[PDB]
Amino acid sequence: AVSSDYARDNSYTKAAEDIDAQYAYSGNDLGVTYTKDATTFKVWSPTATGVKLNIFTKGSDDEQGASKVASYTLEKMLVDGEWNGVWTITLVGEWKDYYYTYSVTTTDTTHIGSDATKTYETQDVYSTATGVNGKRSMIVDLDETDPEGWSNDSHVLLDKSTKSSVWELHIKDFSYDKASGVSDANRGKYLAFTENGTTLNGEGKVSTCIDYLKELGVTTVQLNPFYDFQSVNEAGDDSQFNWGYDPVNYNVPEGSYSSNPYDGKVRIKECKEMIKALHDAGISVVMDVVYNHTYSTDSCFQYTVPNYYYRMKTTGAFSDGSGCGNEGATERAMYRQYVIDSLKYWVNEYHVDGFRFALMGLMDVETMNMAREALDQIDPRITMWGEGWAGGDSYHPTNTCSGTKFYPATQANASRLSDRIAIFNDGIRDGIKGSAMDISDVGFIQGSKSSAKGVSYGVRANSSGTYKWKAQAPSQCVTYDACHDNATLYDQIIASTGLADYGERNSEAVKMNRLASAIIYTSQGISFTLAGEEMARSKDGDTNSYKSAANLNMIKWQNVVDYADVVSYYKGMMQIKSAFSPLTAMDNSYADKYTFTKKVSASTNQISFTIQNDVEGEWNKMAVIYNNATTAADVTLSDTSVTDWVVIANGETAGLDSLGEVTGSTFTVPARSAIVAVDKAGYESAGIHSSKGKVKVNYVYEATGEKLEDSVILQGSVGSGYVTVPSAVIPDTYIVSRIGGNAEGKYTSDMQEVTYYYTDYIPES
Ligand SMILES: OC[C@H]1O[C@H](OC[C@H]2O[C@H](O[C@H]3[C@H](O)[C@@H](O)[C@@H](O[C@H]4[C@H](O)[C@@H](O)[C@H](O)O[C@@H]4CO)O[C@@H]3CO)[C@H](O)[C@@H](O)[C@@H]2O)[C@H](O)[C@@H](O)[C@@H]1O
Ligand SMILES: [Ca+2]
Numbered sequence: 001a002v003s004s005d006y007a008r009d010n011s012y013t014k015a016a017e018d019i020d021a022q023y024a025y026s027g028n029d030l031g032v033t034y035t036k037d038a039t040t041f042k043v044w045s046p047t048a049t050g051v052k053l054n055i056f057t058k059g060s061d062d063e064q065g066a067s068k069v070a071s072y073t074l075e076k077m078l079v080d081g082e083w084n085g086v087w088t089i090t091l092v093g094e095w096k097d098y099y100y101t102y103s104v105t106t107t108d109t110t111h112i113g114s115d116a117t118k119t120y121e122t123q124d125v126y127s128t129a130t131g132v133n134g135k136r137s138m139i140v141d142l143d144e145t146d147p148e149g150w151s152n153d154s155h156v157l158l159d160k161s162t163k164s165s166v167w168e169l170h171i172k173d174f175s176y177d178k179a180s181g182v183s184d185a186n187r188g189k190y191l192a193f194t195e196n197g198t199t200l201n202g203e204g205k206v207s208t209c210i211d212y213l214k215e216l217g218v219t220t221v222q223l224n225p226f227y228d229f230q231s232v233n234e235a236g237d238d239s240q241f242n243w244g245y246d247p248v249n250y251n252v253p254e255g256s257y258s259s260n261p262y263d264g265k266v267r268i269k270e271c272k273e274m275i276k277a278l279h280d281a282g283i284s285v286v287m288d289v290v291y292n293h294t295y296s297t298d299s300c301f302q303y304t305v306p307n308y309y310y311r312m313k314t315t316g317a318f319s320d321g322s323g324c325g326n327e328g329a330t331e332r333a334m335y336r337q338y339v340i341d342s343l344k345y346w347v348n349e350y351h352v353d354g355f356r357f358a359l360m361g362l363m364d365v366e367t368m369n370m371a372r373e374a375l376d377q378i379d380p381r382i383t384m385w386g387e388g389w390a391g392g393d394s395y396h397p398t399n400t401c402s403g404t405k406f407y408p409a410t411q412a413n414a415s416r417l418s419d420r421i422a423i424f425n426d427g428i429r430d431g432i433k434g435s436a437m438d439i440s441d442v443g444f445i446q447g448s449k450s451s452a453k454g455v456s457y458g459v460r461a462n463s464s465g466t467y468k469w470k471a472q473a474p475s476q477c478v479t480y481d482a483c484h485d486n487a488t489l490y491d492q493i494i495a496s497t498g499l500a501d502y503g504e505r506n507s508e509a510v511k512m513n514r515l516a517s518a519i520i521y522t523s524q525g526i527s528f529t530l531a532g533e534e535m536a537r538s539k540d541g542d543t544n545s546y547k548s549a550a551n552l553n554m555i556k557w558q559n560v561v562d563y564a565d566v567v568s569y570y571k572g573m574m575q576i577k578s579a580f581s582p583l584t585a586m587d588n589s590y591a592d593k594y595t596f597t598k599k600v601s602a603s604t605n606q607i608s609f610t611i612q613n614d615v616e617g618e619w620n621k622m623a624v625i626y627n628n629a630t631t632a633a634d635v636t637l638s639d640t641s642v643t644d645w646v647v648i649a650n651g652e653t654a655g656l657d658s659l660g661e662v663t664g665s666t667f668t669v670p671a672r673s674a675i676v677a678v679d680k681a682g683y684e685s686a687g688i689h690s691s692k693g694k695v696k697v698n699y700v701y702e703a704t705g706e707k708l709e710d711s712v713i714l715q716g717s718v719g720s721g722y723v724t725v726p727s728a729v730i731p732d733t734y735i736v737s738r739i740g741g742n743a744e745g746k747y748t749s750d751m752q753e754v755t756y757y758y759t760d761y762i763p764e765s
């Protein structure tokens with residue numbers, strides 16, 4: 001089922017609305033305002049009877065030189081005897097690098113003015129720095145946290161969101177593997193991203209980490225939570241892992257990814273160095289944000305203004321729409337403001353280029369649209385997308401703090417949402433590889449004919465017609481087959497077919513992987529992959545790896561060799577989408593330029609369509625065919641307008657070079673493979689060609705000269721290193737007797753061939 005939302009007004013919502021009408025504050029100076037001469041503290045809490053500032057030398061009581069300094073009484077901000085809801089004090093002198101908490105004595109929202117008070121110690125709601133484990137805030141000069149050349153670091157923004165290629169990455173996963181070639185100190189840390197010239201096992205043969213990303217050519221890296229989360233003990237062991245969907249401090253970097261979580265400035269500088277390194281690599285940084293819930297209701301929000309910041313049921317229970325125990329009340333004036341101010345902070349202070357909203361379905365449409373407008377004032381190329389669903393039933397008031405009707409930012413309400421707030425298309429996801437809820441379930445690539453309609457509607461970003469949900473335009477659609485949640489693409493292929501064990505190479509499974517690649521990059525919308533999808537990433541069948549072993553979760557960098565051909569295929573498919581404007585369109589101007597051979601809703605083993613282009617200097621027409629049959633199929637296009645074709649992607653390779661020609665309207669499409677072709681006239685005139693070198697790898701029985709296994713194609717930049725390997729799937733009764741050509745070397749302009757010659761063998765042991 002899809003979870004429900006309910007409009008219910010009660011004592012709590014009416015109390016919160018009254019608080020907004022009187023005390024809503026837009027002053028822009030809540031938290032700490034540092035200067036060398038003085039530091040000013042501001043806390044918003046209309047429910048409070050008193051607020052006390054506590055100063056410490058260190059962020060925890062374990063550290064050397066840790067001591068309580070003193071405590072101070074904050075005073076109400078009055079004008080002509082009228083309180084604006086804000087507490088303030090100004091400390092004269094130099095207070096930088098001191099740590100602090102607030103002691104808030106307060107009622108709840110439904111008992112303001114009463115003697116029913118409780119006192120809570122808490123970090124600042126508007127913390128820009130904390131000590132270890134985010135318990136104590138830190139007074140910092142943010143200038144001191146700027147790395148070398150930070151002033152010259154610019155945003156990396158896509159001209160159009162639909163021109164993106166997103167690599168969804170977890171910071172520990174990136175470099176926790178020793179084979180990553182990243183230094184001992186920086187493995188699984190922010191600073192891993194700053195290490196150039198890293199290679200597999202540091203042997204200097206093939207690129208890893210940042211150099212690998214430059215070669216792959218992804219436009220965008222989306223980072224899993226690097227705001228401060230609860231679920232990793234920052235004073236604990238290095239082997240701890242969590243995705244970090246457990247927020248504690250929204251505007252403070254995560255401590256565990258830094259080299260030193262005790263000094264609050266170090267993580268800020270190192271977090272900025274990561275973002276700079278990615279910007280220097282020409283890559284856009286998208287931040288996974290989780291305003292929909294906090295780890296617990298024992299939070300800075302609840303301790304400051306009890307029952308204001310969370311959606312309250314009539315029974316006094318916290319609404320659990322997140323499935324994590326609570327949901328943030330985005331409809332409230334001061335959380336709306338907090339969220340928007342937070343987004344602007346990460347953009348301006350950390351140079352973040354966009355956001356992925358966790359459970360965007362829990363966040364109200366008005367708030368989301370206002371956030372889009374705010375970020376537009378900085379730059380409208382700043383990207384926004386999110387999950388158009390919740391994680392449970394959500395109880396909200398009828399209206400927002402503005403007096404407009406509450407609407408959740410779900411798939412169902414895509415029409416009410418800005419067309420530049422994109423939504424994850426679970427339609428094409430389930431269409432391609434099968435239900436995400438069931439690892440054993442088949443989609444189109446595994447041979448489901450019923451799944452074809454999922455793919456076919458996905459091809460135009462679910463923006464043409466209606467199947468499941470409808471995007472306003474391709475700009476409002478994220479096109480993907482897998483993410484960090486549920487099974488990896490290759491794990492679902494393995495589980496659903498039983499072709500092999502998890503993480504084991506299988507020729508037919510890899511064919512299916514290549515086909516998924518073809519679909520993603522011949523589909524409209526914002527193309528998105530899990531980091532390592534291109535190298536057949538496995539989690540050993542883990543369908544919820546959020547707190548699983550770090551070595552299970554980590555990117556196995558050996559896969560860039562083991563699946564170098566698959567990486568090469570993705571690398572080439574990315575080039576195709578980038579070269580052909582209809583695929584990267586933001587609007588619906590190309591919707592009526594598609595000619596599907598069969599009905600879009602057809603149950604078929606072969607999907608085919610043509611796309612008419614209108615951009616001068618590009619290809620005039622593209623033909624796309626997906627064949628999920630176990631045999632080769634002759635597919636005849638219904639569109640006969642073009643009868644001279646150049647093939648640019650097949651079962652073997654993909655890219656901008658001609659792989660052969662086709663006369664007429666009929667194409668022979670190999671089993672479990674795609675064909676991408678373009679009009680010959682256009683291919684000649686456009687002058688679009690590859691600058692990448694090729695290596696063909698053959699596997700031959702020496703005695704007969706016959707192939708034991710299909711040849712594969714590696715592709716990469718001329719001068720970049722490659723490593724070929726003997727085929728993993730060849731029976732154990734054959735052994736490599738001899739190698740022809742350069743098994744290892746650098747790509748050249750001319751294609752090189754490597755042949756692994758095999759002889760008769762009996763394992764024995
Ligand atoms: O008080 C209740 C409860 O609170 C704490 O546990 C919270 C929560 O922890 C687990 O949920 C996990 C999921 O299993 C993960 O898949 C992940 O979900 C996120 C997903 O990956 C994102 O894509 C999406 O945007 O956001 C979701 C989360 O909203 O992360 C969550 C949170 O870590 C567990 O499965 C839940 O049952 C549980 O409620 C606390 O640790 C518990 O002791 C406590 O009982
Ligand atoms: Ca933390």
Ligand code: NA
Nearest residue numbers: 578579580581
């Ligand atoms: Na283009």
